[PDB]
Amino acid sequence: SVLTQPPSVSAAPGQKVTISCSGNNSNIGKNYVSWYQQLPGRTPKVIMYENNKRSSGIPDRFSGSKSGTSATLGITGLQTGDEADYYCGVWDSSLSGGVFGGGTKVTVLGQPKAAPSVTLFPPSSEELQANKATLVCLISDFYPGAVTVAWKADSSPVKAGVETTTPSKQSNNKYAASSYLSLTPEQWKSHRSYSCQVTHEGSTVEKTVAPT
Amino acid sequence: SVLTQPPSVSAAPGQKVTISCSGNNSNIGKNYVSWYQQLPGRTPKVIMYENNKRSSGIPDRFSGSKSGTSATLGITGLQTGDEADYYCGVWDSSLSGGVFGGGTKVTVLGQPKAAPSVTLFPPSSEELQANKATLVCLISDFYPGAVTVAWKADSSPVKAGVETTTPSKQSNNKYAASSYLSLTPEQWKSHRSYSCQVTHEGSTVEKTVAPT
């Protein structure tokens, strides 16, 4: 870290966020400054180049500026999707090489709770032809990332055969997982219906499937 | 991803892994390369710089080198604490900014490798009756826990609305994930088929679905 960047910025949804980048005359003062976004677990991507030029597909929210030996990144209308680390980059002329800042964690404070979207899928045609039956309860767009999944065959709770993936942080910093129930085609065709009940922050969402 | 890295690399504890990072004369060829370690949950840290310089507290087991347009990070005496995601970074003298590799997942093999079980689910009847269409690619029973998923609309790759969850260990100790694709029921019916392609350890499998 040749460039000096604050360790973090926090703001409520819709608010304005500024990120400073402090350097000398050999780097920021002489050369083009670029900005990089890094979503957790993801590699850094360029979002701004040539001090204020926005990279392809980069939203209007994002704004970039250079003045003197200091660069700034402006995010107006902060969204939950902008929660990432931001780095500023410039070529150092003093020591002929590319330099970077320490980074800045951007937090959306007081984030609104998002109920999960729930899509239940019966065993596919191709699957049953292979004497295999799998039900998928796709659980998407929820926040925070914790869920309880319960299954039922008609009225009775299904204990075994259930697997629920650990909620993973999606593109929009919101979450997704999927619960799956592997049955024998004998077990599936026997019952009248199947249920997947998803509990998120105390509230339940239940969807139902039936054969054909 | 401008620089190219293999997505997954593994070996038994005590063995050796190498991670290739391929670029051009303008990036890897001219400038100094760094390597990043992104530990599970934690913030990425630089472990290698100036092609072969190790950071503080980085053991002898980690070695970096660069020949031509490609850099390699080697790891010997592979141990569980090395399991992380690693990426390369270099300045691109033509683009006048930093370029990064897509990342590599390093796995210390603790059980037999397992090829994924792939189940493609078309949009359900209840869903299409609501003018919504969701394709779900259930990927389970695989080890190591890293997949690359590609979607095709007939044969042309789908470049939008694809979400892939992070693999999580299940009750069988093997990993599971799911890739989902959102389409308008017109997008589902305008194509002959949709396909989900799962890449795991250089082995690739294709699943296909068609309307009814």
Numbering used by the authors:
A (entry chain B), B (entry chain A): 2 to 213
Study text:
LCs were distributed in two groups: a set of eight amyloidogenic LCs responsible for severe cardiac involvement and symptoms in patients (hereafter, H LC), and a set of five non amyloidogenic LCs isolated from patients affected by multiple myeloma for which no amyloid aggregation or proteotoxicity was observed in patients (hereafter, M LC). Five H LCs (H3, H6, H7, H9 and H10) and two M LCs (M7 and M8) were successfully crystallized and their 3D-structures solved. The crystal structures were all refined to satisfactory refinement parameters; in all cases the LCs were dimeric, with an overall quaternary arrangement closely matching that of the previously reported LC dimers. CL domains (res 115–214) are typically characterized by high quality electron density, are all very well superposable, and the dimeric CL–CL arrangement is clearly conserved in all the analysed structures (root mean square deviations -r.m.s.d.- generally fall below 1.0 Å over the entire CL–CL dimer - Table S3A and Fig. 4B-bottom).
In H6 and M8 dimers all six CDRs (three for each LC monomer) are traceable in the electron density; in H9 and H10 five out of six are traceable, in H7 three, and in H3 and M7 only two CRDs are traceable. In the structures of all H LCs and in M7, the association interface is roughly symmetric, and is located on the five-stranded beta sheet (strands 1, 3, 4, 7, 8), where the 3, 4, 7, 8 strands establish the intermolecular contacts. Analysis of the data shows that the kinetics of proteolysis correlate well with amyloid propensity: H3, H6, H7, H9, and H16 are almost or totally proteolysed after 60 minutes, and more than 50% of H10, H15 and H18 LCs is cleaved after three hours. Inspection of the SDS-PAGE gels shows that the proteolysis pattern is different in different H LCs, suggesting that the sequence of proteolytic events, and not only their kinetics, may be characteristic of each H LC. It is also remarkable that fold stability and kinetics of proteolysis do not necessarily correlate: M7 displays the lowest Tmapp among the M LCs, but also very slow proteolysis kinetics; H3, H6 and H9 show relatively high Tmapp, within the H group, but are almost instantly proteolysed by trypsin.
